[PDB]
Each structure stands twice: as C-alpha cells, then as structure tokens.
Design an enzyme around this catalytic site. Structure first.
Site, short mmCIF file in Angstrom:
data_model
loop_
_atom_site.label_atom_id
_atom_site.label_comp_id
_atom_site.label_asym_id
_atom_site.label_seq_id
_atom_site.Cartn_x
_atom_site.Cartn_y
_atom_site.Cartn_z
CB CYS A 22 -0.95 -0.02 1.19
SG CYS A 22 -2.03 1.40 1.24
CB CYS B 286 -3.49 2.62 -0.90
SG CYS B 286 -3.55 0.96 -0.32
CE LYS C 127 -5.62 4.49 -5.48
NZ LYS C 127 -6.01 3.06 -5.53
CE1 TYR D 88 -7.66 -1.09 -6.47
CE2 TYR D 88 -8.22 -3.40 -6.50
CZ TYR D 88 -7.45 -2.36 -6.00
OH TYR D 88 -6.49 -2.53 -5.06
CD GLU E 199 -7.86 2.65 -8.43
OE1 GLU E 199 -8.81 2.79 -7.58
OE2 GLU E 199 -6.71 2.31 -8.11
CG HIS F 238 -29.98 22.22 -1.51
ND1 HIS F 238 -30.02 21.50 -2.68
CD2 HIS F 238 -30.38 23.47 -1.83
CE1 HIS F 238 -30.42 22.33 -3.63
NE2 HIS F 238 -30.62 23.55 -3.18
CD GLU G 111 -29.51 18.07 -2.09
OE1 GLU G 111 -30.59 18.26 -1.47
OE2 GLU G 111 -28.86 19.01 -2.63
C1 LIG Z 1 -26.99 33.82 0.53
C2 LIG Z 1 -27.77 32.62 0.98
C3 LIG Z 1 -27.18 31.33 0.92
C4 LIG Z 1 -27.90 30.20 1.34
N1 LIG Z 1 -27.27 28.96 1.25
C5 LIG Z 1 -28.01 27.87 1.60
C6 LIG Z 1 -27.43 26.53 1.39
O1 LIG Z 1 -26.33 26.36 0.82
N2 LIG Z 1 -28.20 25.50 1.83
C7 LIG Z 1 -29.41 25.61 2.42
O2 LIG Z 1 -30.05 24.59 2.74
N3 LIG Z 1 -29.97 26.87 2.60
C8 LIG Z 1 -29.26 27.92 2.19
N4 LIG Z 1 -29.87 29.16 2.30
C9 LIG Z 1 -31.17 29.25 2.95
C10 LIG Z 1 -32.35 28.94 1.99
O3 LIG Z 1 -32.24 29.78 0.85
C11 LIG Z 1 -33.66 29.16 2.71
O4 LIG Z 1 -33.63 28.44 3.93
C12 LIG Z 1 -34.87 28.75 1.91
O5 LIG Z 1 -34.91 29.44 0.66
C13 LIG Z 1 -36.13 29.05 2.69
O6 LIG Z 1 -37.25 28.54 1.88
P1 LIG Z 1 -38.70 29.13 2.19
O7 LIG Z 1 -39.62 28.30 1.39
O8 LIG Z 1 -38.90 29.37 3.61
O9 LIG Z 1 -38.60 30.63 1.54
P2 LIG Z 1 -38.15 31.16 0.14
O10 LIG Z 1 -37.41 30.10 -0.66
O11 LIG Z 1 -37.47 32.42 0.47
O12 LIG Z 1 -39.48 31.41 -0.66
C14 LIG Z 1 -40.47 32.37 -0.23
C15 LIG Z 1 -41.15 32.84 -1.53
O13 LIG Z 1 -42.34 33.59 -1.09
C16 LIG Z 1 -42.53 34.62 -2.08
N5 LIG Z 1 -43.40 35.63 -1.39
C17 LIG Z 1 -43.13 36.26 -0.21
N6 LIG Z 1 -44.19 36.94 0.27
C18 LIG Z 1 -45.17 36.66 -0.68
C19 LIG Z 1 -46.54 37.05 -0.72
N7 LIG Z 1 -47.15 37.73 0.24
N8 LIG Z 1 -47.23 36.68 -1.81
C20 LIG Z 1 -46.64 35.92 -2.80
N9 LIG Z 1 -45.39 35.49 -2.79
C21 LIG Z 1 -44.69 35.91 -1.74
C22 LIG Z 1 -41.11 35.10 -2.35
O14 LIG Z 1 -41.01 35.89 -3.52
C23 LIG Z 1 -40.34 33.74 -2.44
O15 LIG Z 1 -40.25 33.23 -3.73
C24 LIG Z 1 -29.20 30.31 1.83
C25 LIG Z 1 -29.80 31.59 1.83
C26 LIG Z 1 -29.08 32.70 1.42
C27 LIG Z 1 -29.77 34.06 1.48
C1 LIG Z 2 -1.69 -0.63 -7.58
C2 LIG Z 2 -2.41 -0.94 -6.31
C3 LIG Z 2 -3.38 -0.03 -5.80
C4 LIG Z 2 -4.06 -0.30 -4.61
N1 LIG Z 2 -5.00 0.63 -4.16
C5 LIG Z 2 -5.60 0.37 -2.97
C6 LIG Z 2 -6.49 1.39 -2.40
O1 LIG Z 2 -6.64 2.51 -2.92
N2 LIG Z 2 -7.10 1.03 -1.24
C7 LIG Z 2 -6.96 -0.16 -0.60
O2 LIG Z 2 -7.54 -0.35 0.49
N3 LIG Z 2 -6.11 -1.11 -1.12
C8 LIG Z 2 -5.48 -0.81 -2.26
N4 LIG Z 2 -4.56 -1.75 -2.72
C9 LIG Z 2 -4.43 -3.01 -2.02
C10 LIG Z 2 -3.48 -2.93 -0.79
O3 LIG Z 2 -2.23 -2.41 -1.22
C11 LIG Z 2 -3.32 -4.32 -0.19
O4 LIG Z 2 -4.61 -4.86 0.04
C12 LIG Z 2 -2.53 -4.33 1.10
O5 LIG Z 2 -1.23 -3.75 0.90
C13 LIG Z 2 -2.38 -5.75 1.60
O6 LIG Z 2 -1.67 -5.65 2.89
P1 LIG Z 2 -0.95 -6.97 3.42
O7 LIG Z 2 -0.52 -6.64 4.79
O8 LIG Z 2 -1.70 -8.18 3.10
O9 LIG Z 2 0.37 -7.05 2.43
P2 LIG Z 2 1.46 -6.02 2.04
O10 LIG Z 2 1.08 -4.60 2.43
O11 LIG Z 2 1.73 -6.34 0.63
O12 LIG Z 2 2.71 -6.35 2.95
C14 LIG Z 2 3.38 -7.63 2.88
C15 LIG Z 2 4.84 -7.33 3.28
O13 LIG Z 2 5.46 -8.64 3.50
C16 LIG Z 2 6.84 -8.47 3.11
N5 LIG Z 2 7.32 -9.88 2.87
C17 LIG Z 2 6.78 -10.78 2.00
N6 LIG Z 2 7.28 -12.02 2.17
C18 LIG Z 2 8.17 -11.84 3.23
C19 LIG Z 2 8.98 -12.79 3.92
N7 LIG Z 2 8.97 -14.09 3.67
N8 LIG Z 2 9.79 -12.30 4.87
C20 LIG Z 2 9.77 -10.96 5.19
N9 LIG Z 2 9.01 -10.05 4.63
C21 LIG Z 2 8.26 -10.51 3.63
C22 LIG Z 2 6.75 -7.63 1.85
O14 LIG Z 2 7.99 -7.06 1.48
C23 LIG Z 2 5.68 -6.56 2.29
O15 LIG Z 2 6.23 -5.40 2.84
C24 LIG Z 2 -3.81 -1.48 -3.88
C25 LIG Z 2 -2.80 -2.34 -4.37
C26 LIG Z 2 -2.15 -2.06 -5.54
C27 LIG Z 2 -1.09 -3.05 -6.03
#
Ligand SMILES: Cc1cc2nc3c(=O)[nH]c(=O)nc-3n(C[C@H](O)[C@H](O)[C@H](O)COP(=O)(O)OP(=O)(O)OC[C@H]3O[C@@H](n4cnc5c(N)ncnc54)[C@H](O)[C@@H]3O)c2cc1C
Ligand SMILES: Cc1cc2nc3c(=O)[nH]c(=O)nc-3n(C[C@H](O)[C@H](O)[C@H](O)COP(=O)(O)OP(=O)(O)OC[C@H]3O[C@@H](n4cnc5c(N)ncnc54)[C@H](O)[C@@H]3O)c2cc1C
Lengths: 462, 462
Positions: free
Chosen positions: A42, A47, A50, A181, A185, A451, A456
């Site tokens: 690894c 791992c 890679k 895999y 990769e 969101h 989600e």
């Molecule tokens: C900058 C910013 C970033 C945000 N980022 C996130 C985020 O990443 N993730 C997240 O989950 N939340 C985020 N939020 C919060 C999210 O936008 C609000 O929680 C969500 O929009 C609230 O939904 P609501 O239905 O209560 O109101 P709103 O979606 O505000 O809808 C209310 C609607 O009622 C209408 N309305 C109002 N009064 C009247 C009326 N009397 N008659 C007719 N229509 C009317 C409005 O025009 C509007 O369309 C963010 C908010 C802001 C401001």
């Molecule tokens: C290209 C590639 C990508 C991989 N990507 C991932 C990944 O992203 N995620 C993941 O979870 N796994 C991944 N793996 C798998 C992971 O590397 C192995 O599952 C893991 O290393 C196995 O661990 P192990 O202890 O069985 O053996 P190893 O880690 O291979 O260790 C065995 C050790 O024994 C030693 N040895 C052997 N015989 C003797 C002996 N007789 N005397 C003394 N020492 C000895 C060796 O030199 C070695 O150091 C990948 C493997 C490869 C080849």
C-alpha cells in the site's frame, strides 16, 4: 540458538504492522520480519502513490474547465518527473514513520526474508538466525500477476503496477490489459495525464464483479474521457520494435468473426490481470500449512491456518484485497490472541470499496443481482437516479452521477449502495456505517438532506 | 367572487413548492401564490448561485497548486462577468423547471402578492381577486437584515447577499460585516476570486454558535487564506467617497482601549448580519395570526399557527433556516393534512449543516458544550483528530482537516459530529443518517475504513 517471542509477524505491510502494534499494546513481546520496505504494497507501490497520481490526474481534468469557470486557459504540458520526485519523497516520509511506530511500540524489526523451518515447534529462520513464538502471523501480501511466455510470448516486455511506480516519464502510448479496479485506475491516470491510452478487456465492460450499473457507467465514462476500450480483446504476442513494442491482439466479438490486429508503437504495456500471493519461498510445506492451488494460505473465520499457532491475514489469503481489511483482520486477531477475546474476528460482509476512476466509484453491500439471488426477486426493490452534478452547470465537459440503493424485504433494509460521481470517494464512508447498522429506506428518508450536494440525492430517492 | 381550493400556498419557494407538490399527489386541489420568481431565495439568491460561486472560488484555490502538481503555472485574471452570465442562465433554467413542475402537477400558479382579508373564513386577496381554502400555508421566507440609518448613518450604501448576486464585476476591496455562515461564505468567495477582503466580526471568532473547534478552525483558515478578520469591530458610519466608500469602524478588544479606524476605498460593503421574515405586508392582524417581536410566524411542532386552518413553514418561522428543512416540514405537513397522518411532522433534532468555507465544514447534532449541558460532564466523551489531507503532500499551500465526535453515556452514543476539511461537504450526509439512527462509537468502530480518504479518519478515532 532460538530467540522466543509471544508474537512473530512475517511481513511489515498493512496487516502485519497493524496486528503487531495492537498486540504490543496488550503486552505481547513482538517482532516484525520485513525483507523490503515497511508499509508494504500500500505505502510503496499501492494505495498511497496511486492516490497521489489520481490527485494529479483529477487536477488536470478539472483544469480543462478553467476557461469555462472564468479564467484564462491553462495550456500546459504535464511534467511527470516533478510529481514522481514529490511522490517518492512522501513514500520515504511514510517509511520513516512506520519504522518509528514499531520503535515506539518496542516491536523488534528483523530485516530479511523469513521462511519456516522443519522444527515441530513452529520456528522461522531469517539470515541464518532462528526465532520462535506460540503465535506466528503470516502477512506477506502478494504481487502482480504476469502471463507466462509459453502462453503469451513477449509478455515479459510489459510492466505491472510495480513498474508503473518506477516510470520516470509519461509514456506516449499506453495499453493497459485488464478489467478490474487496478486496470481502470491506471488507464484513467495515464490518459488524464496525456498518454494515448487503450484499455484491453476480455468482455464488453469493466468491473464486471461490481453492480451492473457501475460496470456499465464506468465503461461509458472511460470512453467519454478518451480511453479507447478494446472489447473482447486479448494479447497473443508482444515484440520489441524500433519504437517501443508491437502488441498482437485477437478480438472476438459475439456475432462477428475473430480478427488479429497489430497495435504498433506502444511505449507502455501494463499487465493488470490479477495478483498472486507471496508464499512460494516460505517453506510452508515444512509444517504442512495448507494453501489453495494459487498459493493462498487457507484460513478459517478467525484467521487460523490449519496449523495451531499459525495465522494469516491480508492479501496472502486472497479474500477482500484491501488495506483496511488487512488492518482490521490483524487488529481483531491481536485482541483474540492477546486479550483472550474468543469471538474477536472480522466480518467480511459490508466492506466498502472506492475505485479511483474519473469520477470515483463507491460501493458497499450486495449488487442488485446478489440481492435477488439471496432474497428472491419478489423481495428486492431498487431505487436509483442519474444526474449531471451542478459543478458542470457552467462547463462544456460533462460527467454523470449514478446512484443505486438495493433494498430487501418488507422493511426495505438497505443491503447495497452503489454510485459513481464527483464526491463519491468521500461520500461512501458514512453510508457504510448506516448499512452496517441495518439501516432501512425509512432511516434514509428520515435524515434531512444537505443542499446543494450530490450526497443529498441518496436520501431523497423515491 | 371567491374561488375555493383544498390548499392555498403563499410563496413558491423551497417549502411552498414542496408542500404543494406533495399535496397534489394526494389529490388536493392546490394553488401556489408567487410575487417574484419560482424557487424562492434558494434558487434565485441563495443556495444555488452561492454554490456556483463557491465552485468557482474552489477551482481558483486549487489552481494555486497547479505548478506544484507538475504543470506550468496558471497565471490568470478571473473574469467575473463570464461566470455571472452562466450562473444567471442556470438560475433561469431552474425557474423554468419549477414552473413546469407545478404545471405537471396541475397546481395553479397565482402571480402576485397575497395578503389575508378580514373574512372570518380565512381568505387571501391577490391583485383584487379572492381565494379561500380550509388549509392555507404561509411559506413566504425572509430577506436580508440591514442596519437602520438612525443607528449606522450611511448603512444604506452597503449591499446584502441579494446585491452580491447582482454584482457585475469583482469588487477590488470588500468588507463583509457578520460572523455567521453567509458572511463566512461571501468573504471566502470574494477573497478567493481576488478581492482584497476583510470580514468584520463582533467578537474573536466566526461561527460562534457552532462547536468551539469549528469556530476556532474556521477563523484560522480564513486568516490563512488571506481574509483579514477584523475582531471586536463594529461599523459606526459609512460615507460615500470619490473612490467607493469609507467605513468608520470602532474596535474594542478586551484588555485594550476602544479605537476608531477609517477603512478607505471600499468598493463593496456587504451586510451579512441576519435575516428578517417576510410578513409585514401579509395583513396577519386581520386574522389575529401570532408573530414574535421580529415578525416570525409562531407555530407548534406540527406547523400550525394559532389560527385553525393556517400553517407556516420555512424561514418565515425563524427556526433552522435551510432549504431541506423547509422542504421536509412542507412535505410532512402535506401528509398530515391530505393523507390524515396525524403524527406526521419534522423532527428538528439532528439536522445536518454544511458551510461552504475553504475547506468546507460539516456538522450534525450537538456541540460538545451542548452535550455537556444535556448529559452532564461525567457522561460525555469526545474523540477528535487533526491532520493535513494527503492532497497537500505535494503542495506548498496547506489546509487542515479537523474532526470531532461527541459521545454520550456508557454506550457512547454519537450525539454530534463536527468537521472541517477537503471533502467534508460530501462526507457528512451518510454520517447524518447514522446519527439519526442512534449510532454508537462501536457502530463506527465496526465499519471498515475506505483508504486512502479523509472520511476513514471518522471510523478510526481512538
Ligand atoms: C446567501 C444565501 C445562501 C444560502 N445557502 C443555503 C445553502 O447552501 N443551503 C441551504 O439549505 N440553505 C441555504 N440558504 C437558505 C435557503 O435559501 C432558505 O432556507 C430557503 O430558501 C427558505 O425557503 P422558504 O420556502 O422558507 O422561503 P423562500 O425560498 O425564500 O421562498 C419564499 C417565496 O415567497 C414569495 N413571497 C413572499 N411573500 C409573498 C406574498 N405575500 N405573496 C406571494 N409570494 C410571496 C417570495 O417571492 C419567495 O419566492 C441560503 C440563503 C441565502 C440568502
Ligand atoms: C496498484 C495498487 C493499488 C491499490 N489501491 C488500494 C487502495 O486505494 N485502497 C486499498 O484499500 N487497497 C489498495 N490496494 C491493495 C493494498 O495495497 C493491499 O490490500 C494491502 O497492501 C495488503 O496488505 P498486506 O498486509 O496483506 O500485504 P502487504 O502490504 O503487501 O505487505 C506484505 C509485506 O510482506 C513483506 N514480505 C513478504 N514475504 C516476506 C517474507 N517471507 N519475509 C519478510 N518479509 C516478507 C513484503 O515485502 C511486504 O512489505 C492497492 C494495491 C495495488 C497493487
């Protein structure tokens, strides 16, 4: 002479380090044997490097969008060597940390290659010196598979993922062979960074063990990104040419006739066709330790081998080849052995997986087909969606997000979650906790959305 | 004449649209009154255009890293007008979708401003025409707060978030007044896009209602990104100058003497000091509908006003001012009224929040202090970590990731999760599902990690 310990760990990779560290917390007198670099696959060739390369690829893909987001056009050639040097330095920093972790835990580091001896009492030898313990963990991992010359002459001219991490320059033209895999990769990274890339697969789609929706979508996203997916295609031979390599390919699409095609001027041929366990030189036969025909160590649900006092975890056992799996199995084993927790073991169900495609894939639990087989078609309901993330509202380039929830029984227990899309790499973990707890669709229904996010969408399916 | 409906919804924003749509599914004869643009604050001047601008800011921040990731240096001036035009077009596309959603549901759209009449039977008038129903939902949202001239002469020379979305150019020099999420987000966007930006706050830190760790970390990250945080500072007066504005500020740091400072040459002064409900012109008094001293409609847990047959949801009630809250409360109300589900209501506990700072913040549940007050200090345990995401292993610029898990009682029920860091925007949703289900620390412990991600840190705390 023979030195005695409570715990001997063969291999200082993911599972071996974790298991030794936990055992030491419980008072075990432990040692780790490592022939190469701490951190194992690894950290050194897996791992970690890679992910650095994926971050580099991701960056590049996003910068195709720079003008669309209001900036002057970022026209540049990537410099592979810049990132290779930095990647290597990070791996070196990690090697030093893992060494220090063992030192702080007072875990002895035995440098060299271990093999079992024929002593009836399980004993290993390293560099002519013998070590014994009542508990010996085999955590030796695996290595990339390469074809045999007898089957594919010239196969040795290709590289594997190990060789990928030794590349010092971006290959101009790359052909990746495989559909799992690692192949996905590697192809995605090479193509994003500017290599003219093909991915050669035996059937029609990649990731065929994943849910059908992921297999389909991942294949489409690869093609949309410029990876040439060579379907129903296999390598017959490789030859060195004045420029790079020539790959002889046979393509056999259902309903068409087979055809031979030469692929000329290939710089990088990367075999990503499987992994083989690292057991050939362990002298397992000296103790009768059981393996399958591929060399995997056989274990029970508690990581026992067939030999008392000998255990195995991680990739050497061939099941769920992931770093966190090795780690978790190794920690659970340490509590069983050294805290006497007889029920301590890893549950191999509901392990989550990310694939660092473009965009990333996340999955946990059963595919729709797996669920149908287990529960019966009448007892499975799926929910799904497809959308274009709002990131792309302002861009000409597009990626999709697909999501599928697989539900079982009347209560609609969530038995699988499958997705591909921006953010899915970081999105999955928390959903995996919910699935592990037996969440139902109502539990997702009951959670207020965040969101605007992609996430989600998974709590608002209907 | 008076036209009769089952359901009249005043306001076609987040909550009103959602409630009307769900009611129509149940067979209600519904109409929505809207004076301005469908989608309300969120679509037109809120969540949606904010997120577009955040994506633009994020892109820019990442491109500071382009050379570090191996590419030639992306030196460009942002062009505000490019993105403004695209943002506006996306909002227009959404306006058209929400109109069509109402049409497909056969929900009548009444264009104009509603007010209640004095008819004992609750009735509204719009453009001289009267409408009645046994169920009337007030979903009119709110608007930005601005200081009174009597208190801050010249305050009217500043803008609010509404005016932010009308800006056609990047202000050279911006001063944002406020310490809540809107102020934080606006300041971060303006500064990332190149405005010389100050954020003026009454105390020492932003987001003081959030967990202390988030308040601290968010303040530090703002400063590290180049936002000048003007602590213990308030505006006394604003004057028009030959260049922009001059802001007269009083600063009164504990332990120091108060000092007056002029801030010259300000292009954009943005008040982000609060929200006021949109109730002044509704003629609520004609029916005796109860409000607080700020004009919020008072409701019970079922969204009832004090008047039978009249309800309120969303920002007009002053509680949890978020789009998904309005939507969920509006849907739950529709099932209560039109499916006769007498227990249908929104639980306002465990609503998750993201703040689109740099990096983003996610929170769900209780702060550590809230948990201590509720459960007792002896019955709360927190787990936390801080790290630099591996994205930055290769960069000179840095951001941190902080995470806190708040646990209650012997079982260590997870009653709060608080984080800031790359990916936290998409990471939170699934953890919110787990918290809503009553996950314990053991449930997190029991979930295998996904590696390499930031998210795995939340399932590996010790
Ligand atoms: C900058 C910013 C970033 C945000 N980022 C996130 C985020 O990443 N993730 C997240 O989950 N939340 C985020 N939020 C919060 C999210 O936008 C609000 O929680 C969500 O929009 C609230 O939904 P609501 O239905 O209560 O109101 P709103 O979606 O505000 O809808 C209310 C609607 O009622 C209408 N309305 C109002 N009064 C009247 C009326 N009397 N008659 C007719 N229509 C009317 C409005 O025009 C509007 O369309 C963010 C908010 C802001 C401001
Ligand atoms: C290209 C590639 C990508 C991989 N990507 C991932 C990944 O992203 N995620 C993941 O979870 N796994 C991944 N793996 C798998 C992971 O590397 C192995 O599952 C893991 O290393 C196995 O661990 P192990 O202890 O069985 O053996 P190893 O880690 O291979 O260790 C065995 C050790 O024994 C030693 N040895 C052997 N015989 C003797 C002996 N007789 N005397 C003394 N020492 C000895 C060796 O030199 C070695 O150091 C990948 C493997 C490869 C080849």
């Amino acid at each position: 002479a023979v030195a005695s310990y409570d715990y001997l760990v063969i291999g200082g990779g993911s599972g071996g380090l974790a298991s030794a560290r936990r055992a030491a917390e419980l008072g075990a007198r432990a040692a780790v044997v490592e022939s190469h670099k701490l951190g194992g696959t690894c950290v050194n060739v897996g791992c970690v490097p890679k992910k650095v390369m994926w971050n580099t690829a991701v960056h590049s893909e996003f910068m195709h969008d720079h003008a669309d987001y209001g900036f002057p056009s970022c026209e540049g050639k990537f410099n592979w060597r810049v990132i290779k040097e930095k990647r290597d330095a990070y791996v070196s920093r990690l090697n030093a940390i893992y060494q220090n972790n063992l030192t702080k835990s007072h875990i002895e580091i035995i440098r060299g290659h271990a093999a079992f001896t024929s002593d009836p009492k399980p004993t290993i030898e390293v560099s002519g010196k013998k070590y014994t313990a009542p508990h010996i963990l085999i955590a030796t991992g695996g290595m990339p598979s390469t074809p045999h010359e007898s089957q594919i002459p010239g196969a040795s001219l290709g590289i594997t993922s190990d060789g990928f991490f030794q590349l010092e320059e971006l290959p101009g033209r790359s052909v990746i062979v495989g559909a799992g895999y690692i192949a996905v990769e590697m192809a995605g990274i090479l193509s994003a960074l500017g290599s003219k890339t093909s991915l050669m697969i035996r059937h029609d789609k990649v990731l065929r063990s994943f849910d059908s929706m992921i297999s389909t979508n991942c294949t489409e996203e690869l093609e949309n990104a410029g990876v040439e997916v060579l379907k129903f295609s296999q390598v017959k031979e490789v030859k060195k040419t004045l420029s790079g390599l020539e790959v002889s390919m046979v393509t056999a699409v259902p309903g068409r006739l087979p055809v031979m095609t030469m692929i000329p001027d290939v710089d990088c041929l990367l075999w990503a066709i499987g992994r083989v366990p690292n057991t050939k030189d362990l002298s397992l036969n000296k103790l009768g330790i059981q393996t399958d025909d591929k060399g995997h160590i056989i274990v029970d649900e508690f990581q026992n081998t067939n030999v008392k006092g000998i255990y195995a975890v991680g990739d050497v056992c061939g099941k769920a080849l992931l770093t966190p799996v090795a780690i978790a199995a190794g920690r659970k084993l340490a509590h069983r052995l050294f805290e006497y927790k007889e029920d301590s073991k890893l549950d191999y169900n509901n392990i989550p997986t990310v694939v660092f495609s473009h965009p990333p894939i996340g999955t946990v639990g059963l595919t729709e087909d797996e669920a149908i087989h287990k529960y019966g078609i009448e007892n499975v309901k799926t929910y799904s969606t497809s959308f274009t993330p709002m990131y792309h509202a302002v861009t000409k380039r597009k990626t999709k997000c697909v999501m599928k929830m697989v539900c079982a029984n009347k209560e609609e227990k969530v038995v699988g979650i499958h997705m591909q899309g921006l953010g899915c790499d970081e999105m999955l973990q928390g959903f995996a906790v919910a699935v592990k707890m037996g969440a139902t669709k109502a539990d997702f229904d009951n959670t207020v959305a965040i969101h605007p996010t992609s996430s989600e969408e998974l709590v608002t399916l209907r």
